[PDB]
Amino acid sequence: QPAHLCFRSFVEALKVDNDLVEINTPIDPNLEAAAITRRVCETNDKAPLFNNLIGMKNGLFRILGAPGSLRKSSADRYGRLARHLALPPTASMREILDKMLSASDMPPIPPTIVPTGPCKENSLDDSEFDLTELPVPLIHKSDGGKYIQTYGMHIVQSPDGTWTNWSIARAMVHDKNHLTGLVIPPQHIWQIHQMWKKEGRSDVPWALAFGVPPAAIMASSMPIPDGVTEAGYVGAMTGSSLELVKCDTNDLYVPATSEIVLEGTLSISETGPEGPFGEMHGYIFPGDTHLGAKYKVNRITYRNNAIMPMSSCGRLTDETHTMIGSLAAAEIRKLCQQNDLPITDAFAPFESQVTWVALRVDTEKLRAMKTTSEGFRKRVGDVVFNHKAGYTIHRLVLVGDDIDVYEGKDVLWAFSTRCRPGMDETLFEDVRGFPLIPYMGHGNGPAHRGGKVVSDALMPTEYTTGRNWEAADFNQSYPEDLKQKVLDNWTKMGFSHHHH
Amino acid sequence: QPAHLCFRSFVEALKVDNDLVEINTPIDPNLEAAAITRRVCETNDKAPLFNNLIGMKNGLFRILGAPGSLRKSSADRYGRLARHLALPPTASMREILDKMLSASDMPPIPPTIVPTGPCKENSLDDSEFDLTELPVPLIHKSDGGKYIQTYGMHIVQSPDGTWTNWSIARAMVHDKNHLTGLVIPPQHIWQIHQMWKKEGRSDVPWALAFGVPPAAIMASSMPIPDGVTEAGYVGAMTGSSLELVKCDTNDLYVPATSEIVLEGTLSISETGPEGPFGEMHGYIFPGDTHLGAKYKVNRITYRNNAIMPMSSCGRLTDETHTMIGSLAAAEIRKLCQQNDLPITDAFAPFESQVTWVALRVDTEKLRAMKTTSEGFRKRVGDVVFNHKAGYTIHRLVLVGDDIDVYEGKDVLWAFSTRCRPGMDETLFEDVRGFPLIPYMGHGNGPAHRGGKVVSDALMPTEYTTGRNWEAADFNQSYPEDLKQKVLDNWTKMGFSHHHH
Numbered sequence A, B: 001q002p003a004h005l006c007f008r009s010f011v012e013a014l015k016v017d018n019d020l021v022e023i024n025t026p027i028d029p030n031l032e033a034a035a036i037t038r039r040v041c042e043t044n045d046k047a048p049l050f051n052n053l054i055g056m057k058n059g060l061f062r063i064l065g066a067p068g069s070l071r072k073s074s075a076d077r078y079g080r081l082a083r084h085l086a087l088p089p090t091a092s093m094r095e096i097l098d099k100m101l102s103a104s105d106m107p108p109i110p111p112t113i114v115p116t117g118p119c120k121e122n123s124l125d126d127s128e129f130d131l132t133e134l135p136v137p138l139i140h141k142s143d144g145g146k147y148i149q150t151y152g153m154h155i156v157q158s159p160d161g162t163w164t165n166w167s168i169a170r171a172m173v174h175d176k177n178h179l180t181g182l183v184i185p186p187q188h189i190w191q192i193h194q195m196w197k198k199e200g201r202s203d204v205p206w207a208l209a210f211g212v213p214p215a216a217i218m219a220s221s222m223p224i225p226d227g228v229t230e231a232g233y234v235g236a237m238t239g240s241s242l243e244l245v246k247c248d249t250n251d252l253y254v255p256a257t258s259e260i261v262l263e264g265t266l267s268i269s270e271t272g273p274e275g276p277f278g279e280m281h282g283y284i285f286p287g288d289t290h291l292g293a294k295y296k297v298n299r300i301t302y303r304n305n306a307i308m309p310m311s312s313c314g315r316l317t318d319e320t321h322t323m324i325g326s327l328a329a330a331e332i333r334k335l336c337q338q339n340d341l342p343i344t345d346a347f348a349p350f351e352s353q354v355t356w357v358a359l360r361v362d363t364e365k366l367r368a369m370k371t372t373s374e375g376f377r378k379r380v381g382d383v384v385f386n387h388k389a390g391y392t393i394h395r396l397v398l399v400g401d402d403i404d405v406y407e408g409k410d411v412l413w414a415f416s417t418r419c420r421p422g423m424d425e426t427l428f429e430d431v432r433g434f435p436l437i438p439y440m441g442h443g444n445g446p447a448h449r450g451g452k453v454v455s456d457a458l459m460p461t462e463y464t465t466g467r468n469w470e471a472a473d474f475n476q477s478y479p480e481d482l483k484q485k486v487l488d489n490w491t492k493m494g495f496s497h498h499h500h
């Protein structure tokens, strides 16, 4: 099976790429696996495959860390993401995001049901498993639980059957047969949960599949529109219908090659302690436990020699940056364009801890709009910050066509030099805020409202007659023939490879 | 003579450090020298010494580019600055700034007058030189003149004789015997100029010395207090009285080993076209010429085989970042401490284009103040933004003790995650602004007023009971013994030198 369609094949691909370290000696799921993975992520090293996890029994489980993190070289920096999508390992972030947006003006390709798959190789009923006995990692030393779920896909379906959502939301072990996790607005797992609560008749049928097709985990991490079934979006993106098998204890369908599947229910009534967790912004607040959603597990099925993916998230750079930020930015770009805004590109700079999105403006279009900064900032901010795709993003930085928004140095240069604090910004206090940012949920104001800003780093003439500067840099401050001479004579004079 | 006391010795030291490329073939001062230097600065390469400058005649002149720019390795990143100060080449930025502040609570050591020095080896009277015939560089292709003066020291003295200021301010050739340059408030060259204008009786006696003692050019770039003679501050910092020789045509005194000296007058009445120039923030606005101050040159003296230092300034990283930003930050740190503010460290992040200063707060002291963010931000901003040391800085970022302000990644992390836009900031519109920032002088508001902000990246409990988080990073999220195990086993497992 191709790597983008099968997690086991994906692991092989990382090995073949020389992007994998297999660790065959015993590794403790209590902090050690996650510490190694954390160091990987902070250094852009090879992904760790823990083949000999202390506490593994009867095939549950090995761990792959850092599935969507960065490689060291510039040339294949995003190669791990490219391997989720059948793209060349040298693919640019623009190409990755375009691939992830491509299904948005395609017909869905619904999934295909097949009678069995590797995810049925082994099973454990409700008398045979105990979640507290599995080698579930403690990821950060102050976490409030063992976070089994950092890179699996929750599957829930609307009561009427018409929308099946796939998404990543964290969850931790509560007891032998339950998890607790975050289920918060405006996320689709929350929106579906609310539909079941209002019906009031039963708990939500649920499954959690780990080690799913890589292209599916990418869509699981992306804020595609309300009501859109991820399976059919992934089918259209990949050009192939995904093969799914029915759960044994409910009528949900899971990817046939899933490594591990939990089947059960998400309660419409019960809660339990959840968190704290070392989160995407780089912090944990020890002792900050709050009530979260509660899941009951009735059945586990799994592949022979099952592998659990894990994100050891926190400070730069991991899946919470590469996937959450970039995929939100992609959806924002599209949303802006659909609202007739002249946005060509969007990216969440890593330097901002993916709390900013830089929006590249087609300034020729802007000029034809015959508008002003105040008006344009307000329009952009209303579109983005009133939409779910803007949820996680607290600052939008508008930049003109000279800036490559995928290069954080250039975004920071433009922000710092072209946006006058205050005057060139519009604050938004009456929009939904992202409570997980420390200055929100642990800050001075409402955790759930406001704290957003549009920062205009467009210069005045970009609205009127066109750019009126040149950069004071090697590229723009010297003629072509001179630059080329300098470059040709560089090593000859005494001064100091792309791939590496 | 030691390197910090003699520019010629400084050049030798760079050679001995393997931090110099001597270019002995012909190089054009029309853009080529500056293009090479620009590429050096953008790549942290070795400093270029242009020994064979097209248009050099009778000893005027060779060029050294990039005198205060960065080296590639982390270990000696600031080595060129350390060589200005007699510090080891591995000196930290903290150590460099502390050296530059050290003279602030020392008695001055006034200069010593000697009868001659190398700067008298050659001379040209007013019938023998023409500034338009010298190999003065065109530094950026759109510059409005040939900027002879990018790393020399202007010398002017108050009418009463009591204060002699040394400072860097740009200047360009106007004609055979005049320069034009920037002389703007609140700079000390401007303040002295105003004293002469109010007296109304004569032009200001002036000299411009190029290739001065490196320790003197560093103080020339620093906003030490009003009324303080730089020569005596440099004497105290270095522990030695500087040796100066009298000008021939006026009674000012110049460093004995200056490479090149211009003697003349800064007019109290006349102006001429000045600029545009590719500036510290990374831009040039072609065609933006305005009237500047006008200098008349009466005499040139110079060393045999004179060397002119040059800054090819613009986008990161050059002397306008390493020296302007860092030295302002140092003076701000001191100013804050003298105003009883609990500031331990300050630095201007390069990522901000040195328009921010991050201020590290001693949060134990803060807690004893029993204050709030609103109050504290206002107090810090009033102290800094009402003072000349704050002139160039438009954003202050307050951070707690965990943040190393000399590491821009960490400042950006703290700013983006701990300062709620709007709520945690105080805007200052009634303070002097720095017009050279594009969003000021080419922006939407007054060029000279406002546009400043204090951004509080202190978290709420840092004012009250103490930090209540741990970072979700390798350092803080795992116990000591585990980290050390991981590190010890790193290469054994299969994962990937300080000097490099």
Ligand SMILES: Cc1cc2c3c(c1C)C(C)(C)CC=[N+]3c1c([nH]c(=O)[nH]c1=O)N2C[C@H](O)[C@H](O)[C@H](O)COP(=O)(O)O
Pocket (backbone or CB within 6 Å): A149, A150, A151, A165, A166, A167, A168, A169, A170, A171, A182, A184, A186, A187, A188, A189, A220, A221, A222, A223, A224, A311, A313, A319, A320, A323, A324
């Ligand atoms: C990649 C990724 C995405 C996380 C995520 C993580 C990763 C690795 C974790 C597991 C390591 C840490 C926490 N995460 C949560 C999360 N969204 C959410 O509501 N709760 C979470 O707990 N997300 C983001 C969520 O997947 C995106 O917002 C999706 O758009 C949600 O899909 P939906 O649009 O269908 O609701």
Ligand SMILES: Cc1cc2c3c(c1C)C(C)(C)CC=[N+]3c1c([nH]c(=O)[nH]c1=O)N2C[C@H](O)[C@H](O)[C@H](O)COP(=O)(O)O
Pocket (backbone or CB within 6 Å): B149, B150, B151, B165, B166, B167, B168, B169, B170, B171, B182, B184, B186, B187, B188, B189, B220, B221, B222, B223, B224, B311, B313, B319, B320, B323, B324
């Ligand atoms: C290092 C450095 C400092 C420049 C500078 C440059 C460099 C290389 C240039 C020459 C390449 C470009 C322009 N610069 C000017 C400048 N200050 C100023 O008023 N006008 C300038 O034109 N400065 C900053 C000035 O030296 C500091 O603000 C000092 O504090 C001024 O000394 P003072 O406090 O005695 O007034």
Ligand SMILES: O=C(O)/C=C/c1c(F)c(F)c(F)c(F)c1F
Pocket (backbone or CB within 6 Å): A170, A182, A184, A185, A186, A187, A277, A278, A279, A280, A281, A313, A320, A324, A391, A392, A436
């Ligand atoms: O646990 C964490 O670090 C991230 C939780 C998280 C997320 F990353 C998101 F993008 C969300 F939209 C969301 F609602 C979340 F709760």
Ligand SMILES: O=C(O)/C=C/c1c(F)c(F)c(F)c(F)c1F
Pocket (backbone or CB within 6 Å): B170, B182, B184, B185, B186, B187, B277, B278, B279, B280, B281, B313, B320, B324, B391, B392, B436
């Ligand atoms: O020409 C340039 O790029 C810088 C001019 C400049 C400067 F760098 C400063 F720090 C000043 F304080 C100042 F007044 C200036 F004019």
Ligand SMILES: [K+]
Pocket (backbone or CB within 6 Å): A166, A167, A168, A219, A220, A221, A222, A223, A224, A230
């Ligand atoms: K999704």
Ligand SMILES: [K+]
Pocket (backbone or CB within 6 Å): A418, A419, A420, A424, A456, A457, A458, A459, A460, B439
């Ligand atoms: K602007």
Ligand SMILES: [K+]
Pocket (backbone or CB within 6 Å): B166, B167, B168, B219, B220, B221, B222, B223, B224, B230
């Ligand atoms: K000075």
Ligand SMILES: [K+]
Pocket (backbone or CB within 6 Å): A439, B418, B419, B420, B424, B456, B457, B458, B459, B460
């Ligand atoms: K704050």
Ligand SMILES: [Mn+2]
Pocket (backbone or CB within 6 Å): A165, A166, A167, A188, A223, A224, A225, A228, A230
């Ligand atoms: Mn969805």
Ligand SMILES: [Mn+2]
Pocket (backbone or CB within 6 Å): B165, B166, B167, B188, B223, B224, B225, B228, B230
């Ligand atoms: Mn001074």
